[PDB]
């Protein structure tokens with residue numbers, strides 16, 4: 001009933017933003033979906049870290065000690081943003097610590113260690129395919145996976161595919177029960193999300209999310225949302241701009257989430 005209005009409002013937000021906006025909502029109360037450019041490709045940037053962390057969690061289902069396995073951090077492993085890993089240079093971090101740093105602080109060195117643990121970007125993609133995601137592709141390590149060049153298929157997915165995958169990982173059965181709970185705990189402990197999807201939602205709703213930022217002013221967020229009194233929602237908001245040096249626009253993601261919420 002409200003869906004025509006939501007579509008109109010998302011288009012008006014996009015027009016005022018100057019950029020290109022992609023939205024996918026799944027309401028798990030009734031499997032309703034609301035999409036805006038839901039089948040167009042967008043650069044994932046650091047939102048791809050959810051897939052990498054989940055792939056390591058899947059490996060840990062058959063290796064009970066895997067998350068405690070130490071990984072060496074060398075000075076040469078530091079990249080453009082690595083607030084956790086830099087404390088451990090010439091030392092080690094466990095795979096659990098790398099997963100938490102990648103997800104909750106968006107540490108790019110930590111993401112690179114997860115990618116390497118999976119055999120490279122193609123190993124992350126192979127895990128995506130194993131859980132039914134035919135759209136996701138990871139092609140590069142950080143920081144270059146965040147270049148976000150328009151038209152480049154590398155390191156992209158669609159909002160529809162990412163919402164479905166995030167649902168399967170956090171609420172469905174793609175991971176074992178303990179691993180699903182650990183992923184949800186990590187996402188709920190994210191430090192980077194208060195200005196993005198969360199900022200558009202009622203403060204009483206619990207959120208776990210993973211943000212992303214990259215070239216072309218790319219500003220992304222993927223979230224699982226537990227509204228008050230309601231089954232959870234999954235929401236992807238992806239946003240990218242026409243000039244390489246464009247500024248971040250987390251407010252656009254908040255505005256998209258607000259429009260989605262007001263139409264529930």
Ligand SMILES: *C(=O)[C@@H](NC(=O)/C(=N\OC(C)(C)C(=O)O)c1csc(N)n1)[C@@H]1N=C(C(=O)O)C(=C)CS1
Nearest residue numbers: 045046047081106143146147192211212213214215
């Ligand atoms: C994931 O998206 C990561 N993004 C980046 O490394 C890039 N830019 O992000 C920062 C450094 C925050 C920025 O100035 O926008 C990047 C790599 S190559 C390029 N042109 N830009 C991490 N993502 C986030 C996040 O938004 O979640 C961070 C907070 C840390 S970097």
